[PDB]
C-alpha cells in the first residue's frame, strides 16, 4: 500500500524533538528520484543558513525499503548524509498518512521523533497530527515556518 516514505510526494521536515538540532540546518525536504526492486531513492535536501554569507543548498542521495504494514523503515544513506546528519539505518514508523509521517529512532529509549508533512501543511499542521507529535515525542521542537525555505 501507499506510505509517504516510498510515495512519489516530497515531505518536508515539520518538527523534531530538541535533541537531533544541528545548526545552521534549513529548509529540510527529501524528493523522490526513482525505484529499483523494493529500494526506493530519495534525496535529502538541506539549506546551509548562514547569516550571512549566502546560504547553501546541499544535496545527499539515500534509499528506503519498507515491506508492507511494516513498523519499520530500512534506510540505506550514503556515507554524507549518514556522517553529517546522522542518518540511522533503520526508523519505527509511529503512524502516518498519504500527506504526513512520524518517525521514531528504534534504538534509542528517549526515542527521538521527526515529524514530515507534504507541502499543503508546511504553514500549519493538523490538529491531530501535531497532538499526536507533542504526546509520544519528547521535546517536541516544531521547525519554525520561513517562506525563503518554498517561496510560494
Ligand atoms: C500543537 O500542540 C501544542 C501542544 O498542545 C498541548 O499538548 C497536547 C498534547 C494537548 O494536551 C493540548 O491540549 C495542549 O495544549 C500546542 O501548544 C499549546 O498551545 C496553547 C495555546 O493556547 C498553550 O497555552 C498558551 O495559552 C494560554 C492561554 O489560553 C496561556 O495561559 C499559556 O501560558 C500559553 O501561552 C499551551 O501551553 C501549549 N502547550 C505546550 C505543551 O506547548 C500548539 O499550539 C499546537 N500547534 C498547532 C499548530 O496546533
Ligand atoms: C523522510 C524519510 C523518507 C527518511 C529520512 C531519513 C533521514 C535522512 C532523516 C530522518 C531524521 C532526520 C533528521 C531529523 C532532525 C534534524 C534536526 C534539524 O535541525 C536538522 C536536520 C535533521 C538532522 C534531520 C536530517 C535528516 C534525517 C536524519
Ligand atoms: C536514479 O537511480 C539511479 C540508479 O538507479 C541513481 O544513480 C540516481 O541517484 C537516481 N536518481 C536520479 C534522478 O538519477
Ligand atoms: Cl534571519
Ligand atoms: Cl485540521
Same mark, same amino acid.
Given at each position: ?20 538540532? #544541528?545548526?545552521?540546518?534549513?529548509? *529540510?525536504?527529501?524528493? /523522490?528520484?526513482?525505484? &529499483?526492486? %523494493?529500494? !526506493? ?5 538541506? !539549506? $546551509? ?12 542521495? $539515500?534509499?528506503?525499503?519498507? #515491506?508492507? /504494514? ?8 550514503? =556515507? ?9 539505518? =533503520? /526508523?519505527?514508523?509511529?503512524?502516518? %498518512?498519504? %500527506? $504526513? ?10 526515542? &527521538?521523533?521527526?515529524?514530515? *508533512?507534504?507541502?499543503?501543511? *508546511? =504553514?500549519?499542521?493538523? #490538529?491531530?497530527?501535531?497532538?499526536? $507529535? ?6 517536541? *521542537?516544531?521547525?519554525?515556518? =520561513? ?6
Amino acid at each position: 500500500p501507499s506510505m509517504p516514505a516510498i510515495n512519489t510526494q516530497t515531505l518536508y521536515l515539520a518538527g523534531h524533538s530538541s535533541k537531533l538540532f #544541528e545548526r545552521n540546518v534549513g529548509c *529540510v525536504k527529501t524528493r /523522490y528520484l526513482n525505484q &529499483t526492486g %523494493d529500494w !526506493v531513492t530519495r534525496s535529502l535536501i538541506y !539549506v $546551509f543558513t548562514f547569516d550571512t554569507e549566502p546560504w547553501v543548498t546541499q544535496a545527499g542521495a $539515500f534509499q528506503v525499503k519498507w #515491506e508492507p /504494514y511494516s513498523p519499520l523503515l530500512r534506510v540505506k544513506a550514503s =556515507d554524507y548524509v549518514r556522517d553529517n546528519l546522522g542518518a540511522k539505518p =533503520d /526508523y519505527f514508523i509511529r503512524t502516518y %498518512d498519504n %500527506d $504526513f509521517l512520524l518517525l521514531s529512532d528504534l534504538k534509542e529509549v528517549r526515542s &527521538t521523533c521527526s515529524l514530515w *508533512v507534504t507541502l499543503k501543511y *508546511v =504553514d500549519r499542521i493538523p #490538529e491531530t497530527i501535531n497532538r499526536t $507529535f507533542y504526546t509520544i515525542c519528547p521535546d517536541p *521542537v516544531p521547525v519554525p515556518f =520561513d517562506e525563503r525555505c518554498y517561496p510560494g
